[PDB]
Amino acid sequence: HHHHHHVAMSFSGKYQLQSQENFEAFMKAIGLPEELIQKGKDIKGVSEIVQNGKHFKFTITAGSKVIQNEFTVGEECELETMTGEKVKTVVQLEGDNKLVTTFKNIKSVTELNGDIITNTMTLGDIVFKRISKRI
Numbered sequence: 001h002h003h004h005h006h007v008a009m010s011f012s013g014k015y016q017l018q019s020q021e022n023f024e025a026f027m028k029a030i031g032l033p034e035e036l037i038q039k040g041k042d043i044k045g046v047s048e049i050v051q052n053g054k055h056f057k058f059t060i061t062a063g064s065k066v067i068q069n070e071f072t073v074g075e076e077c078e079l080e081t082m083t084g085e086k087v088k089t090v091v092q093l094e095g096d097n098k099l100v101t102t103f104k105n106i107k108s109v110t111e112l113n114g115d116i117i118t119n120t121m122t123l124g125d126i127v128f129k130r131i132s133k134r135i
């Protein structure tokens with residue numbers, strides 16, 4: 001029962017929305033329309049995470065709209081948000097299945113734990129959480 005062995009972890013896989021904290025507080029603060037907020041907590045969207053050595057891909061799926069972003073780890077690359085805001089940043093791995101990135105005042109800390117994703121964002125005095133699980 002349960003057999004695995006590897007040095008690093010595989011980001012490659014698809015994950016569905018499970019749970020969330022400070023979603024409305026964060027979304028109202030970044031200035032999202034209340035339609036995208038009511039559908040965003042009511043409907044469970046889908047996520048995908050893809051790793052290609054130094055390259056990295058991420059698919060966001062919020063009910064029907066799909067956003068695809070690409071970046072290269074340790075190199076300056078431009079990332080699109082849910083509203084279409086394109087912002088230059090770099091993403092670093094801490095060697096522990098966890099990617100960290102910062103734009104201005106929004107502190108992203110991603111974490112992968114096998115079949116579970118844990119995403120923790122912090123914009124100023126607001127602290128948004130997202131949890132997803134493998135499909």
Ligand SMILES: CC(C)(Sc1ccc(CCN(CCCCC2CCCCC2)C(=O)NC2CCCCC2)cc1)C(=O)O
Nearest residue numbers: 017045046047058060061062069079080099108110119
């Ligand atoms: C159901 C759905 C629609 S799925 C969904 C939606 C949004 C997120 C973002 C959260 N985020 C924080 C950081 C937010 C900025 C991020 C930059 C690159 C990709 C776009 C946004 C993030 O993914 N960080 C890193 C990023 C690329 C490298 C590894 C992960 C994640 C899943 C929902 O959650 O509503």
